[PDB]
Design a protein around this motif. Structure first.
Motif, mmCIF file in Angstrom:
data_model
loop_
_atom_site.group_PDB
_atom_site.id
_atom_site.type_symbol
_atom_site.label_atom_id
_atom_site.label_comp_id
_atom_site.label_asym_id
_atom_site.label_seq_id
_atom_site.Cartn_x
_atom_site.Cartn_y
_atom_site.Cartn_z
ATOM 1 N N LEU A 288 0.826 -1.203 0.000
ATOM 2 C CA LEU A 288 0.000 0.000 0.000
ATOM 3 C C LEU A 288 0.863 1.255 0.000
ATOM 4 O O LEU A 288 0.531 2.244 -0.660
ATOM 5 N N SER B 96 -2.407 -0.750 -7.133
ATOM 6 C CA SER B 96 -3.847 -0.657 -6.944
ATOM 7 C C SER B 96 -4.497 -0.312 -8.275
ATOM 8 O O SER B 96 -4.043 0.594 -8.980
ATOM 9 N N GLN C 225 -12.203 -0.266 -7.307
ATOM 10 C CA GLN C 225 -10.818 -0.119 -6.882
ATOM 11 C C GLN C 225 -10.372 -1.426 -6.245
ATOM 12 O O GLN C 225 -11.042 -1.937 -5.344
ATOM 13 N N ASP D 95 -7.224 -3.369 -4.367
ATOM 14 C CA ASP D 95 -6.017 -3.078 -3.606
ATOM 15 C C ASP D 95 -5.057 -4.257 -3.652
ATOM 16 O O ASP D 95 -5.409 -5.354 -4.088
ATOM 17 N N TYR E 47 -11.524 -5.436 -2.922
ATOM 18 C CA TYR E 47 -12.055 -4.560 -3.956
ATOM 19 C C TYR E 47 -13.419 -4.044 -3.533
ATOM 20 O O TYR E 47 -14.228 -4.790 -2.972
ATOM 21 N N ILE F 127 -6.476 7.284 -6.743
ATOM 22 C CA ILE F 127 -5.393 6.527 -6.133
ATOM 23 C C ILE F 127 -4.073 7.157 -6.555
ATOM 24 O O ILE F 127 -4.000 7.906 -7.529
ATOM 25 N N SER G 30 -3.976 10.982 -3.780
ATOM 26 C CA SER G 30 -5.233 10.320 -3.447
ATOM 27 C C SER G 30 -6.154 11.211 -2.621
ATOM 28 O O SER G 30 -7.325 11.396 -2.965
#
Lengths: 230, 222, 207, 231, 234, 243, 203, 241, 208
Positions: free
Chosen positions: H16, H124, H140, H142, H147, H155, H159
């Motif tokens: 992330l 992502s 979206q 990840d 999702y 993103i 963001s």
């Protein structure tokens, strides 16, 4: 291989007082078509060994490659390989027989009949037969194909038993072999006028007389035949 | 691998992950089973966002807490097994049988890779019977029946509420008890009514609002 | 799986004793039932590998039991393939090719043999041996008492004396157990009555 | 150090510690002596007993009538290596009717042992072997070590305190290689050499094991009563 | 120690793999002509006992595709063999000669595979493919150990990458392809940029030149390099 | 240091430390050299006599591959044997698919791929040997030297082992003195002299000189060992040049 | 012959906005008639699949398509449409190209979104036979083809569609030895399905 | 990839973070279409940025954009195409709906999150698509495989600011061109460097495009609904902006 | 220490008790863990019930496979051996100890066994496994007699319930009893039966 397509007909060989003589014609036949006349079916594998092969020519070339690989791999890490611990006729024949029998067992046979002829380091003549089925045997005289029927009696008339080998000189054995070639040329439809002859002698080593001709043919009696019946 | 003193690290930490996930609530009635979830954002698509309550077969549903990613794997495993059972036998799976399978799939990943960080409530009715069914599961791979139970991040609080809150009689009392458990712990709630004959329905926002306004009027009364 | 700089790779169990003689081989094991409820008859610390081979063990842990099954399979397959009972040393090699062990048995090749596996898995043929926590005290007595003319009758009382010397409880036909292999009888376990009369013979010797 | 625990790690100086500790494994084992003449090759081994009541370990493994070997170090690794050598010689005999040359056997064992010293998970063989045999090229003697190194030798000794035996063999090299037509003096020289490696112990009818192979001698192992004439 | 995320989100192992590309200390250049693509790369022969003909980093990948590698020669040769295998596989599987950019893409994907699987380390090499595409014309495609790749109007790589890049940028901004009329002219042009940017004059032994033309990628021999150098001196 | 307990690792400098530690193993090996002729290549190697018990002239260290390739190495000798075995089976496979003996550049490529592969995975150790190999094919004579890292180049003369530096200096002086190149007969003696000079800085122990060579003229293109009369001529030449 | 061993008939027709699929009920082993309740028409939501041929394969495919269509319904949240179901059946039949089921299926239904009648037929190994008028399979394929060709005409309303399909099946079965013992006709509409059992010769 | 004592998956948070280090990407749902936008960085002025498109077609009705590690996105995209064909279209004769393909891509990325020897994907995705039953969609996805559908989302490194801007601009009655206008403004506000048709790129999931179908004469087949806006098309809008 | 930690896990499982009479074998468990493996044999476990599922299913499959390979059903010895063998093979390992009890085919002698994470198994006349196994075992040693064994089903059930009630809080809601009898006459005691026996013993415990 399930069926032979291009084939070499026959090989004959006999052992005499000092070594072994072996001969084979140079013709590979595609069925009844005498297609290839330059094939060599005597495969020297050393100064003490020559391998005669019959049957499928492609399998013969495969076997020749196997013998070349044997010679190559014997020399690896073998500092004595050129004079002792060299490949004897017995080792070549045993490897070939093992390969042939294994191929037979896997139902993928090499359609060849192989005569391995030579002399062991102790001077004893080596002469053995092996065919596609793995059947092996030794004899003072060996032949393949039509040679087993036409030529082999002629050679046996010279050396009928092991006691006759020391009585047989180089010239006698060579005359017998050449006469067998002439007879096979007469009566074998797959045979050719040209043949190769190899002599392994415990004293003088391997002599390899290539592209010999069949000579002294007898045809002049054919002029008197006047067809069937009358 | 076991921890000294007989603990199991990864299962404990998967339980922590479950404890930090969003809640899932369940209540079983005399004639129906009701499952409730708090949806817990202004741009998130409400029209198509999946409900936490999921069908595993025509007669049985699953609700989960914890890692959302692992819930999909668990749900598809359960669905595949439920259909395979009908492939082998004519009769559809019993609720007990399905909860047993999901417990097994959860367990197998702990001894075999990480455990699923998911705990679930399972509700439904047997293929040709009519008794209500409600069952629970957790990452360790163990299950039990219940009269009303809850999982997730509010469990330590709402669980005693449900213990405080003779099963309820009729579906109105079932949905009332569910929504009152959701509201008493502090209208954005999913409610799914499971009824025999495979009638599985989710109550609309306006139905939720009706019940919620009635219960807030009752709360104003005291 | 790793050698130390000294060239080596990187005892608390119950005691078992055995003696080998020109007449036979005798084995003995401490039973030590942990409760009067436990079925003493179900403590099989001595098992047959083949009709002329038995194994006495410090404890029949499942790792030992898998080895027992492998040895039994080796003996049975040897009989199947060769139509002959497996020789003791060959059986020990086969097991090694696969816990403290006293592999002992009889064959016409080397007569009566007793084998003990050293910690590195190398079997040594022994005239007399003891294992378990009692081996430390037993070994001196075994070195003292064994003689080439030892009879099986004397060997039984020898093993029983070792058990009496090392065991934590007064010998009886239940808390200790004997077994022997003989050319004519094969591997056999002394029943409770025979063990009892041997214990009374030991007491008479003491008296 | 941090490079000791794995076979696939070189030390900063380029040493393979995990193989040198395998060499230490042979340094743990008891002495075995080997020597040869142009016609005979001899092995001499000092066996070990775990206890006064225990029999001795057989330190000589017979492959067949023309070849055999002795051990120093971990016996089970000797079992594995010897059965592999047996497999190779047997394969050679079946497929070629050919007596596997002793140098070929030595290099086959070298190749097999090298594999454990390069791939992870394998352990170097903690045993060294002396291999003797007689073939079309005469008598042979080989020294095998865990690292895979195989050496052809007139004589050698491996095991504990083998340095004295090797010193005696080096001193008498010009003599015992001359021994012709008879094995007795060669075995006598071998037992004299092994005697150099004895401390608080002496050669006895139960400690000693002798083996020989040569032109007129298929591989035979002398032990017990048979070795009494040499002790 | 392995290709896994650090808390910063960086793959330190891949970054180390980038740094390995400068171990050889040689610079390279690729430029696109109207009808040809050229490679100039320094041949540094530290030892006089070496055979200079065998010291090379330019690889003939297929009939049309040439490749240039910076970084250790073992990894470069591994990548070159893999690229040759991929090109032969494509020609066999899809029935036509492999495009240059599609080869760049599969090589980038293969490099990315190492960047994710911890079983194997990335190759410490940067590959530069050059071709005159059957459809897209002259092409240059530089590939990175990270699995990143992109086409280029001109490319330079090595310790002094920035200087050659600056010179190329200045030339292009002062003038997408070189207006020369024959491949020899553009080879000379690239050699002059090597001379200016590195401030060094090369002997016929210090340079490697691979020229990509329709249905032929070939590497210039020493005497051809001498011809180009004397043409520059002219 | 760190980053050097594993094989498939780059250090922050971009250096595969385990490969360098393997290289340092080569630096402890006995000297081996190779020299290209006008029509062939010659190989030589020091064989240290650890004791008088070693059988003279039987513990060979130069190895043939197929029939036209000669290989010699220094470092962990069994690693060199492993590499030569792989090279032998690669040559066999090439001679099986095709029929010409594997070209020396092709064989060098095969060996470089095999050795470099061992530097890719954590699970396998790098080769501890630097191998000098070469041979004669349709395009004359080739000489290659291959390092533990898998890198290899074509060489006019190569030397590896403990005495590599002085051997390299003398090989440079050799190729300088003979601008017209060496004959096989000359090169055998020359390599004997080079090896003898190499030992002089490693003279703590006795040694045996083993020589081998392949040439279009004097072997008809097959790898062979120096023996007998020519071997002794080389030995006397080397000793005379040292005396 | 696996396809002829059990007999059985299936026929499908398209009305103006409705479809009809009908089958006989006989199950037997060549000469011997075994059961009169082997209904060969199966439905998965709003799409109907009739299957003639070897009865073991009929049952196996009924189970397989029940499983696959239930999974489709669950993970898609919508019922499988006649076109998608036709593609699924085609793919499943070809999966065993070299070990095929000895069946001839016939799909019939109304696409829920477009509301258009849909019918299709298959061979042993999944050759799609999309047709706009009517589909025929079974031992009486020849009789049914001739009869439907003579009787069928476009834009039949449900009552006349029922009469046409029932007469075609009845007269076709009366001339087939391995078919009969009653028949069942499904009349499928955008909002209802009517199942009817026909009276016919019981020989 | 294992649970930490706090219950978090350890290495996923690092993925992330890598995504947060990526360049800004956008997605906006109009009532009659979907817009996905992103700025494309360049390694050097010499690099042909037109060679690489961060937006890519998964199915003629579905398109994807990403923020994070580009090579990971590329391999995940061709994996996604492979699964969309082999697993769904090979069976059902139709392309998977946005929900199903999003689920399969999430499964692909989740396998790395639940398997040893492989790190999670560092990207992502925003997967825009359309269905005959579910309608327009924007998801979206990840690195963890989680999702969620979004009305509009952003993103990358921009963001939070982009999200707070979309929250203001988005409404239930946007047409596709209004969505394109909002996307252009939002992405312009996030691009720190030069902003023109070559640095930005757009794609739309809108009405049918028979002009892109490539053949004629089949009334039933409709043509791709996904299409990229060319550099000139974007320049036209930025000039009209 | 892996098996040691598995045994620690066993130490936290609910307690199970078994008693063998002349004609009966009875299993008791704190509040069915006692589960039928074949018609004539049952298995009880203490520890991780999650890990117990695999063991139970393997045991059941092996019993049926034996009945399929040999015409005869499994003996209790055979099933105990198989349970031990499987429980070894996973040495994470299963954190469960077990009891196996029942009758052999066409048999009359009740059998009872215990099995341990070590794979050790031994026959017992009465045995306990679980958290408070030590106290219950000590209680049994002073209440069971090898030389005066239980004679009837009533005695067996009384002894089992009395042993469990040593530590159990409230028997009616906190214990369960199953009775295994020859020829697959296995039965599980219902609530009213267990309450009858519990009250019968309660009437005496209060008196001393």
């Amino acid at each position: 291989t399930q069926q032979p397509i291009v084939t070499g007909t026959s090989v004959i060989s006999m052992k005499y007082d000092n070594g072994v003589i072996i001969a084979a014609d140079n013709l590979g036949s595609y069925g009844s078509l005498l297609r290839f006349n330059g094939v060599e079916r005597l495969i020297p594998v050393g100064d003490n060994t020559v391998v005669g092969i019959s049957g499928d020519i492609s399998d013969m070339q495969h076997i020749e490659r196997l013998l070349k690989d044997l010679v190559t791999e014997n020399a690896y890490d073998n500092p004595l390989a050129d004079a002792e611990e060299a490949l004897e006729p017995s080792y070549i024949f045993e490897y070939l027989a093992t390969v042939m029998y294994q191929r037979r067992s896997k139902m993928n046979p090499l359609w060849n009949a192989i005569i391995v002829a030579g002399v062991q380091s102790n001077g004893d003549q080596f002469l053995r037969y092996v065919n596609l089925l793995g059947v092996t045997y030794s004899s003072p005289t060996l032949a393949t194909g039509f040679g087993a029927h036409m030529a082999n009696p002629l050679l046996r008339k010279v050396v009928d038993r092991e006691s006759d080998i020391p009585k047989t000189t180089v010239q006698v054995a060579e005359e017998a072999i050449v006469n067998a070639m002439r007879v096979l040329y007469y009566r074998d439809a797959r045979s050719s006028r040209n043949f190769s002859l190899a002599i392994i002698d415990k004293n003088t080593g391997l002599t390899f007389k290539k592209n010999l001709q069949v000579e002294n043919m007898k045809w002049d009696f054919a002029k008197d035949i006047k067809g069937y019946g009358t | 691998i076991f921890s000294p003193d007989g603990h199991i690290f990864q299962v404990e930490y998967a339980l922590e992950a479950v404890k930090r996930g969003t809640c899932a609530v369940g209540v079983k009635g005399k004639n129906c089973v009701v499952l409730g979830c708090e949806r817990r954002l202004k741009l998130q698509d409400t029209r198509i966002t999946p409900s936490k309550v999921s069908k595993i077969d025509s007669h049985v549903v699953l609700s989960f807490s914890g890692l959302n990613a692992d819930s999909r794997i668990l749900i598809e495993k359960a669905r595949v097994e439920a259909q395979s059972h009908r492939l082998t036998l004519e009769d559809p799976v019993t609720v007990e049988y399905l909860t047993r399978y999901v417990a097994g799939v959860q367990q197998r990943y702990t001894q075999s890779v990480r455990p699923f960080g998911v705990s679930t409530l399972i509700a439904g009715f047997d293929p040709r019977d009519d008794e209500p069914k409600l069952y629970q599961t957790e990452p360790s791979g163990i299950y039990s029946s219940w009269s009303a139970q809850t999982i997730g991040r509010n469990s330590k609080t709402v669980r005693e509420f449900l213990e405080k809150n003779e099963p309820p009689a009729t579906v109105e009392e079932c949905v009332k008890l569910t929504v009152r458990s959701l509201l008493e712990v502090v209208k954005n709630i999913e409610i799914t009514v499971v009824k025999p004959d495979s009638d599985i329905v989710a109550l609309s926002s306006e139905e939720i609002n009706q019940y919620v306004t009635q219960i807030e009027q009752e709360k104003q009364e005291q | 799986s790793t050698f130390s700089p000294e060239g080596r790779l990187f005892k608390l169990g119950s005691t078992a004793i055995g003696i080998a003689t020109k007449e036979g081989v005798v084995l003995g094991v401490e039973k030590r039932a942990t409760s009067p409820l436990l079925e003493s008859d179900s403590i099989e610390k001595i098992v047959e590998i083949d009709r002329h081979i038995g194994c006495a063990m410090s404890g029949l842990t499942a790792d030992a039991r898998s080895m027992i099954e492998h040895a039994r399979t080796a003996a049975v397959t040897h009989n199947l393939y060769y139509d002959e009972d497996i020789n003791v040393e060959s059986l020990t090699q086969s097991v090694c090719d696969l816990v403290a062990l006293l592999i002992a048995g009889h064959d016409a090749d080397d007569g009566y043999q007793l084998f003990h596996a050293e910690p590195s898995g190398t079997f040594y043929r022994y005239n007399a041996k003891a294992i378990g926590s009692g081996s430390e005290g037993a070994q001196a007595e075994l070195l003292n008492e064994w003689h080439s003319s030892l009879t099986l009758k004397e060997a039984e009382l020898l093993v029983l004396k070792i058990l009496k010397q090392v065991m934590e409880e007064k010998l009886d036909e239940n808390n200790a157990q004997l077994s022997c292999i003989t050319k004519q009888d094969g591997f056999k376990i002394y029943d409770n009555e025979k063990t009892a009369e041997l214990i009374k013979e030991l007491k008479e010797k003491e008296a | 150090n941090n490079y000791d625990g794995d076979t696939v790690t070189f030390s900063p100086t380029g040493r393979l510690f995990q193989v040198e500790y395998a060499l230490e494994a042979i340094k743990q084992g008891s002495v075995t002596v080997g020597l040869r003449s142009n016609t005979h090759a001899v092995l001499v081994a000092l066996k070990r007993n775990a206890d006064e009541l225990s029999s001795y370990q057989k330190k000589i493994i017979k492959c067949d009538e023309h070849m055999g070997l002795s051990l120093a170090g971990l016996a089970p690794d000797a079992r594995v290596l010897s059965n592999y050598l047996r497999q190779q010689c047997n394969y050679s005999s079946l497929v070629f009717n050919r007596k596997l040359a002793v140098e070929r056997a030595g290099h086959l064992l070298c190749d097999k042992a090298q594999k454990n010293t390069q791939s992870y998970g394998g352990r170097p063989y903690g045993v060294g072997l002396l291999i003797i045999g007689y073939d079309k090229s005469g008598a042979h003697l080989l020294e095998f070590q865990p690292s895979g190194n195989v050496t052809e030798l007139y004589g050698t000794a491996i095991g504990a305190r083998s340095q004295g035996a090797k010193t005696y063999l080096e001193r008498t090299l010009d003599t015992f290689i001359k021994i012709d037509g008879n094995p007795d003096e060669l075995i006598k020289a071998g037992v004299e050499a092994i005697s150099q490696s004895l401390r608080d112990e002496s050669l006895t009818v139960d400690n000693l094991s002798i083996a020989i192979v040569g032109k007129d001698t298929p591989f035979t192992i002398y032990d017990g009563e048979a070795v009494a004439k040499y002790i | 120690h392995i290709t896994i995320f650090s808390p910063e989100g960086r793959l330190y192992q891949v970054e180390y793999a980038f740094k390995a590309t400068n171990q050889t200390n040689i610079n390279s250049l690729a430029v696109r002509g109207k009808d040809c693509t050229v490679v100039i790369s320094q041949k540094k022969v530290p030892d006089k006992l070496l055979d200079p003909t065998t010291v090379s980093y330019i690889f003939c990948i297929s009939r049309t595709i040439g490749m240039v590698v910076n970084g250790p020669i073992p990894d470069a040769r591994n990548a070159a063999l893999r690229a040759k295998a991929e090109a032969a596989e494509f020609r066999y599987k899809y029935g036509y000669d492999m495009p240059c950019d599609v080869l760049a893409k599969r090589m980038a994907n293969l490099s990315q595979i190492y960047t994710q699987r911890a079983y194997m380390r990335p190759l410490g090499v940067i590959l530069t493919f050059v071709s005159v595409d059957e459809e897209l014309g002259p092409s240059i495609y530089k590939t990175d150990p990270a699995g990143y790749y992109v086409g280029y109007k001109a490319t330079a790589t090595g310790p002094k990458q920035q200087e050659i890049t600056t010179n190329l940028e200045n030339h292009f901004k002062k003038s997408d392809h070189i207006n020369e009329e024959s491949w020899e002219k553009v080879v000379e042009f690239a050699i002059t940029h090597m001379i200016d940017a590195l401030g060094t004059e090369f002997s016929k032994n210090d340079l490697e030149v691979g020229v990509a033309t329709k249905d032929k990628f070939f590497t210039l021999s020493a005497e051809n390099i001498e011809e180009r150098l004397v043409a520059i001196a002219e | 240091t760190g980053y050097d307990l594993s094989n498939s690792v780059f250090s922050p400098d971009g250096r595969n430390f385990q490969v360098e530690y393997a290289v340092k193993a080569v630096e402890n090996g006995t000297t081996s050299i190779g020299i290209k002729c006008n029509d062939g290549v010659v190989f030589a190697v020091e064989k240290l006599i650890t004791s008088k018990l070693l059988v003279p002239q039987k513990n060979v260290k130069i190895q043939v591959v197929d029939r036209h390739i000669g290989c010699v190495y220094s470092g962990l000798i069994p690693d060199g044997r492993h590499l030569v075995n792989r090279g032998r089976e690669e040559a066999a496979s090439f001679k099986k698919l095709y029929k010409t003996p594997i070209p020396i550049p092709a064989f060098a490529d095969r060996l470089g791929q095999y050795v470099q592969a061992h530097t890719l995975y954590n699970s396998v150790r790098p080769f501890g040997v630097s191998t000098i190999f070469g041979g004669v094919d349709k395009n004359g004579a080739h000489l290659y030297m291959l390092e533990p890292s898998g890198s290899y180049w074509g060489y006019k003369g190569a030397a590896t082992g403990k005495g590599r530096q002085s051997a390299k200096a003398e090989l440079e002086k050799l190729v300088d003195h003979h601008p017209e190149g060496l004959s096989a007969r000359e090169a055998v003696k020359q390599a004997a002299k080079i090896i003898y000079l190499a030992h002089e800085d490693n003279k703590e122990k006795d040694f045996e000189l083993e020589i081998s060579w392949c040439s279009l003229s004097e072997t008809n293109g097959l790898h062979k060992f120096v023996k007998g009369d020519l071997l002794q001529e080389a030995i006397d030449f080397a000793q005379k040049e040292i005396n | 012959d696996p396809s002829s061993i059990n007999g059985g008939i299936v026929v499908a027709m398209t009305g103006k906005d409705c479809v009809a699929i009908a089958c006989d009920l006989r199950l037997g082993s060549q000469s011997l008639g075994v059961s009169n309740k082997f209904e060969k028409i199966f439905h998965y939501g709003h799409v109907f699949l009739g299957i003639t041929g070897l009865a073991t394969d009929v049952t196996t495919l009924n189970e397989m398509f029940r499983y696959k269509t239930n999974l489709y319904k669950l993970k898609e949240e919508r019922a499988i449409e006649p076109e998608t179901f036709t593609q699924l059946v085609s793919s499943s039949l070809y999966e065993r190209r070299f070990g095929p089921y000895f069946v001839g299926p016939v799909v019939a239904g109304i696409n829920s979104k477009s509301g258009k009648p849909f019918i299709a037929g298959f061979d042993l190994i999944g050759c799609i036979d999309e047709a706009k008028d009517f589909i025929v399979s079974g031992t009486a394929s020849d009789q049914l083809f001739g009869m439907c060709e003579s009787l069928y005409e476009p834009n039949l309303e449900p009552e006349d569609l029922f009469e046409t399909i029932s007469q075609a099946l009845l007269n076709a079965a009366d001339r087939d030895a391995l078919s009969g013992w009653g028949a069942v006709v499904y009349i499928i509409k955008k909002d209802e399905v009517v199942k009817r059992y026909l009276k016919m010769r019981q020989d | 990839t294992t649970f930490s004592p706090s219950g978090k998956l350890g290495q996923i948070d690092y993925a992330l973070t890598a995504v947060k280090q990526g360049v800004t990407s956008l997605g906006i749902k109009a009532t009659n279409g979907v817009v996905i936008a992103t700025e494309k960085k360049s390694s050097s002025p010499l690099a042909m940025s037109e060679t690489l498109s961060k937006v890519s077609l998964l199915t003629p009705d579905i398109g994807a954009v990403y923020s994070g590690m580009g090579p990971d996105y590329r391999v995940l995209v061709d994996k996604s195409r492979k699964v969309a064909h082999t697993s769904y279209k090979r069976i059902y004769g139709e392309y998977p709906p946005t929900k199903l393909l999003v689920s399969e891509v999430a499964k692909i990325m989740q396998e790395a999150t639940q398997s040893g020897g492989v790190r999670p994907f560092g990207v992502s995705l925003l997967i825009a698509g359309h269905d005959e039953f579910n309608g327009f969609s924007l998801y979206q996805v990840d690195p963890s495989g989680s999702y969620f559908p979004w009305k509009a989302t952003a993103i990358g490194k921009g963001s939070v600011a982009a999200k707070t801007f979309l929250e203001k601009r988005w409404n239930d009655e946007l047409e596709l061109e209004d969505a394109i206008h909002i996307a252009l403004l939002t992405l312009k506000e996030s691009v720190e460097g030069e902003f023109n048709g070559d640095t930005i790129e757009l794609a739309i999931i809108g009405d049918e495009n028979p002009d892109l179908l490539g053949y004629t004469g089949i009334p039933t087949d409709k043509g791709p609904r996904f299409r990229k806006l060319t550099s000139q098309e974007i320049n036209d809008r930025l000039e009209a902006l």
